[PDB]
């Protein structure tokens, strides 16, 4: 969604991207904590210690 | 939806430790009108001759006597939780004007911050607060800030 909208990347001279970049860093921050819950959620029961 | 508020809180807690110390005159727990003229004077404009008591009247009443870190952590949950239903902003608006003094100035173009968190929503939003234009927006400083916030409390009233 973020490389699809029409505007130049390297022009200042629409200064619209700046509410779409800080749109994109809430949901890099909801993918962050999304693998935090998917490391903590994937050793719930654990056949060995070697392999897991 | 409502993802905005997490990120901002969980480093905010580490900037509201030495937000609270720079702050306090004596840098301690307890919190006075005193220590407010004191960093008035550090941000060296002149406060209006009210703001001792401008806390107080409509806002500051349930609990009673001097306040304190404890207070101040009280008040300190009073912005975010609440809702479009006016709330108490009283003392906070100035700590949220120094925890966004990172220049001993004023700041430029932070503003869509604490309004992207308190909404996603176009230019509206701050074109009732302000005109930044996004070339060169305006150098703020707590006097622009401060009456700003209260004349749109008191306009939405």
Redesign the interface.
Known sequence: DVKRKPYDLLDYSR??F??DF??FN??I??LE?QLQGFVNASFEHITSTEHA | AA??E??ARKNEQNELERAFNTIDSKGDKKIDAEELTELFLRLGHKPKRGEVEDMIWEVDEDCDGCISLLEFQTLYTRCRDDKTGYEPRGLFNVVEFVMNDKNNQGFITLE??MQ?MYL?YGRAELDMQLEQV??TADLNSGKILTLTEFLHCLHTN
Do not use: H
Request: a negative charge; zero cysteines; aromatic letters at 10%.
């Open positions: 200064n619209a700046d509410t800080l749109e809430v949901q921050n909801d904590l | 993802a905005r997490r990120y869509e911050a992207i996603r996004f070339g």
